[PDB]
Amino acid sequence: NEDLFICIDHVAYACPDADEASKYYQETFGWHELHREENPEQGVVEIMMAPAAKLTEHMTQVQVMAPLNDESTVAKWLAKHNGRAGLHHMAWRVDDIDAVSATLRERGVQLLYDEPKLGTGGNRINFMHPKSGKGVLIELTQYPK
């Protein structure tokens, strides 16, 4: 036995306008914007929303993603769904991406990257192949230190 995952870190939601999604969540749902990052090189803008002003240990957030250009992954995804905004993927928080990644590989799970890369913030991330997720794109994410 061994718990590889701390909790669901966030559920990613793709849409055409990230700042609009945030205002809506805040004003209509009473959720809070905890982080907003714009990745020029990636052509994507991402905002983290939470049902509370302060995160609790295992509080899952909602990550809103939006395109900055037609070449971004989100844009291509939106195109694949003919402009239909929706759930994109799930991210599961891990204590040690390397250790866990090694474990998953043994289990027969295949990862998108051989080595973790920098995600939103100082987080090291990787993804499982869709099939490994049984139809769901599942991201692995570890917070710094």
Add this chain to the structure above:
Amino acid sequence: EDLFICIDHVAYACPDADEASKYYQETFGWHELHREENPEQGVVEIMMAPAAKLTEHMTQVQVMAPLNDESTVAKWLAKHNGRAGLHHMAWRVDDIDAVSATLRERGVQLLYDEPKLGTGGNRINFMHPKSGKGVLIELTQYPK
């Protein structure tokens, strides 16, 4: 003020709930907390958690599978070309009646006029895709 406690669970629809759960346990080390089977709705549901014990705001994964071809889960699957995947997100609330009122008062469209009964004895309702702007968002209150 805050209308939502936390994301209660993320629903995942698939052909076989049992196979999915075994996979989650064997490969991911996740834990199966409860299993439910509703023969009238023709649906089997299984609640999974990344830990054996749920912490107060710990979100679970709800695995959904059909008992027959006439179930909404089967239709959703056919609608999606047989591809299993994320079905919806559910947000937990302290008082479903109080929150539903606030939501409507703010122009949100709810599927049911009055909270419905779901699995586990939970009162629930949903927001129209336009309300959840793309994703199906469920509202759920625990019975205590």
